Design a protein around this ligand. Sequence first.
Ligand SMILES: Cc1ncc(COP(=O)(O)O)c(C=O)c1O
Ligand SMILES: Cc1ncc(COP(=O)(O)O)c(C=O)c1O
Lengths: 387, 387
Amino acid sequence: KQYDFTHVPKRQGNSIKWGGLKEKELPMWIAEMDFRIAPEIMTSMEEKLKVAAFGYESVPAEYYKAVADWEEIEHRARPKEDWCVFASGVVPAISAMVRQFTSPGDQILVQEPVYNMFYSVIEGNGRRVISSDLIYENSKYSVNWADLEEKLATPSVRMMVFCNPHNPIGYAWSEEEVKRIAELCAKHQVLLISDEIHGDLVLTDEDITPAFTVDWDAKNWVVSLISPSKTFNLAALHAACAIIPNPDLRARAEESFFLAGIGEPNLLAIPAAIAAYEEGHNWLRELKQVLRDNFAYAREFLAKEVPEVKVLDSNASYLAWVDISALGMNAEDFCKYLREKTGLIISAGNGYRGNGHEFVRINLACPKELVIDGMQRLKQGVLNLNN
Amino acid sequence: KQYDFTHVPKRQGNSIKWGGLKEKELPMWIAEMDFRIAPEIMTSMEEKLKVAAFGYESVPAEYYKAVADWEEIEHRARPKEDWCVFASGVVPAISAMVRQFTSPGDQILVQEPVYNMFYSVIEGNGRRVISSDLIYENSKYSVNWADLEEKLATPSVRMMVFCNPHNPIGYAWSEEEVKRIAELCAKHQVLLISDEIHGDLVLTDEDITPAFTVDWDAKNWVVSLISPSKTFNLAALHAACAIIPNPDLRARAEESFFLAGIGEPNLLAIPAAIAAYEEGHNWLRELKQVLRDNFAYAREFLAKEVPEVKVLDSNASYLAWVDISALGMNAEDFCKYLREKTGLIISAGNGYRGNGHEFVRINLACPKELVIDGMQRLKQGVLNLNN
Ligand SMILES: Cc1ncc(COP(=O)(O)O)c(C=O)c1O
Ligand SMILES: Cc1ncc(COP(=O)(O)O)c(C=O)c1O
């Protein structure tokens, strides 16, 4: 290993994951890593600070080239550089496109259970969430394609926020899955917002199919959203990119970003994202080895010692989605009890809606010692409910 | 001098002010400085990068306490910390509050000539600009109070965006003026948005009266917006703060910031803004003397060498508002010609509406060597018109 995946970075006091924690508490909930970032990214940030003045910045061509090269090398899918639009973050970008591309009262389709912020930005903006729930049978989720299409074909359903890879279940959709969803959207004149923030984190030999790769019958109805945030542990960098093949939709999205105040990079976003996308390949390769090892440990350990929970098969993300239905306890109550009894803090599934009240979500992007600790604490919590 | 005000910071290529220039061009248009930032802010950024991991961050109580301390020490006007809400930018905060507190088609009052982004955020959001124009007589601007009140009393006039100190004329309103405008707004149930981003840059012995200091007859109708960005040359830091005494308005504004994606700090906003507001007093004191020296130089040089222009008397900001009406040329025509013939790039006043076509705006926040160069180029451009 050329990089450090053993030492937990010591945060300042306002960290959400680590701030204000009792002693020995173990946070494994919010989706950020307990690894130092790639030193090539750190080098770029430290070089930028040498300017020692931080006035207004433009988005350089080098930024879009870096995004396009990254998508080509890592995902065999090069976007055209002119498809790319900087935004300060994925969820702010979705929020702006909700306002620009739908009207108040319109419905926006998601596939529950899904990332909670999708509901916040839809409902907070005065749009209405509609779900084609994922079907859960035999420890696997699947799409009810007829229901999905009937909902997309509804006149007031105007946008689909598609989570690709899907958070929290950790599923990188197949090529014909993505192509089918895009064709359904296009046929029914629905804009497909493809949130691909987990796209660099496919752990099997499968890979992401970005929405921008679908053929031109449908490519004019898609937006791909990417960011180095999840991949490189850079949530607070506020650097993202919308990839929008449709030139007019693209320009409208850009204008909505500027009006909302999310179209201009902060003092680090451009050099740091360029460094990640140009020089982060080796660090990501080693990261995936660590994550595969951590998932292998969690799956082997919970299969052997905690048969009352079921880690779902997932091919993407560093988040494990764990069926706790056999405990007969609402996930929020269980997570509260588990924290009080063991100090382990994991995410209750309820906020993802769908059938999330039967699940917990566990963040495995930390050093293996923390994974070993956390799994034992989860075992302790499950078996002491038995008493 | 303890600090460096002679060396221009060496920017990277994607700078709005210094990027894409031709040989020997001298930019003095956009409002950012050509000074290094205070070393106390610089160190806080360098130390924060050492965390080497940038996940999610809360806004700590210490941020609002630093805002309160700064306002108390610099302006003798201590806001209650509970009034304060982080936002990533002043103009984005105005944009969010336009959408939250007015309806499409409603009128929003400004005082022309005024900062061009006021028009952008009002009209881009589908609201209508109404102006109570500042009256311009004898090289000074004044308020038509009857006209202002008549417009505020119009039912469709729902918000006033108040520039305090006023850009581009560089005028810090008197206490009586701020209180009078606030009471007019409250009397007619108009929300007063007081943009105080220039409030730390009063160059005379006068000071700003922040809107949040008005008495409670009217304090429930005001929002004060502040930021270290103008004061400390931190446009790209994306740290600002709304001060909203009314708790119901405060709750609604805070939710609007979160929905727009401007309510959460990037990786540097918190420690850098805190260092600025806790340790930037001495640097700002030295900056103000450098700015006064540059304004003194420019006024004396232009009075002696270019009597065809008149630098207006101003008490705030580092932007000179220069009456070019004696040149007999539209400011946009003059500034184009000036850049072509001399390479000096200043702002045409046309974008500020009002009587801005008779003015240019010149940024004096740069080393004296650049002020001398810029003044000579401006003289040469004036000289070459009647040749
Ligand atoms: C599916 C998904 N989208 C978006 C985000 C957050 O993205 P950003 O912080 O750039 O807004 C997350 C959280 O990591 C996520 O899981
Ligand atoms: C009056 C005024 N308001 C707002 C701004 C922009 O501030 P921010 O970048 O924090 O949105 C400026 C830029 O100098 C300004 O002059």
